[PDB]
Amino acid sequence: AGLNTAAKAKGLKYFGSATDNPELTDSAYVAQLSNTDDFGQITPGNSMKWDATEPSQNSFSFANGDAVVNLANKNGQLMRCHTLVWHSQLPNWVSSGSWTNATLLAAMKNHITNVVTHYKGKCYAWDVVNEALNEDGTFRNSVFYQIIGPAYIPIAFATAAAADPDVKLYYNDYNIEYSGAKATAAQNIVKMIKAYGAKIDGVGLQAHFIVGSTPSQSDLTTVLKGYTALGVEVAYTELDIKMQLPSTAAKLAQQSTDFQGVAAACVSTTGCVGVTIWDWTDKYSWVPSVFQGYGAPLPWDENYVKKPAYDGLMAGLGA
Numbered sequence: 001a002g003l004n005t006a007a008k009a010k011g012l013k014y015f016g017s018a019t020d021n022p023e024l025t026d027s028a029y030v031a032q033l034s035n036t037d038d039f040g041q042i043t044p045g046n047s048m049k050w051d052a053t054e055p056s057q058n059s060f061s062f063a064n065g066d067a068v069v070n071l072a073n074k075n076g077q078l079m080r081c082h083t084l085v086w087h088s089q090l091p092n093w094v095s096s097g098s099w100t101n102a103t104l105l106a107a108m109k110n111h112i113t114n115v116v117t118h119y120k121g122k123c124y125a126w127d128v129v130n131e132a133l134n135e136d137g138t139f140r141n142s143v144f145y146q147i148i149g150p151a152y153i154p155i156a157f158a159t160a161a162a163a164d165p166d167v168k169l170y171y172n173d174y175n176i177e178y179s180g181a182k183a184t185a186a187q188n189i190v191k192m193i194k195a196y197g198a199k200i201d202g203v204g205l206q207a208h209f210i211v212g213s214t215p216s217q218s219d220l221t222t223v224l225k226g227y228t229a230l231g232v233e234v235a236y237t238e239l240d241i242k243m244q245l246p247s248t249a250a251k252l253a254q255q256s257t258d259f260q261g262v263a264a265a266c267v268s269t270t271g272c273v274g275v276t277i278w279d280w281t282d283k284y285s286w287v288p289s290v291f292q293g294y295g296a297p298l299p300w301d302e303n304y305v306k307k308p309a310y311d312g313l314m315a316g317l318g319a
């Protein structure tokens, strides 16, 4: 019994975790990441992004991504590959470049084709385009939007599908898990890609939530079904629930309830294929400076010891 076994019993394809290459020298860490009772799927937190894979123009660098795939392969875990086109973690040669539509499309397509071809057959899913929207539902004024216009999004999907016709292609974003202008805009991006005639198989809902401010199971489920209704599968792709510090028993209990609701929403939704937590131990959680004051976001603590949230996830998965 563990998260992945429970998830699969309920019909999900996996419960899984992200990781990153600096953690892999920690053999105790790796032993639990490799426990397929809890994790049937791995995401590389950083080593398949554009800054990692094409840090200078045309210079593809796959060793760190390959090391994560090799670990997953050894363990019999699925991969989700993350992420091709994104405004963040973009090398300066792209973000600062002097582009025309043709020249940026060439470089963007070259990035996709090379990365996706290299990983052909190794990935369950690709996050093809990440965080294309602002909070108010406008397009982000990234280099792609400013130079190419909205077509960059369906072109990226079409390019990925040409390189690897069978991997599931996802649009991934945060703050699209509750209703609002941003979730509506994410729906409209799905419709727009499909109308262009490009393949989109999934919406990735990052699920970076806050303890005590997490959307209810009911709200989350409703929003998932708003996506599945458009003809895509859905997954929670980067789940973590940071709490306002310091940690307390009451907050740990609330955090358990919050995680429980997310797992239950997925299990309740036909077409929700799985949940990936954004790493699994607080020691390696993602808490950048903009969230100073928050922390302890994950189901195991910094000592690799389960927190109440682990039991909350199990309950939410019906175990």
Ligand SMILES: *[C@@H]1O[C@H](CO)[C@@H](O)[C@H](O)[C@H]1NC(C)=O
Pocket (backbone or CB within 6 Å): 101, 102, 105, 147, 148, 149, 151
């Ligand atoms: C860039 O080229 C694509 C592909 O033909 C097209 O859909 C889009 O409108 C173009 N954008 C600009 C700004 O010329």
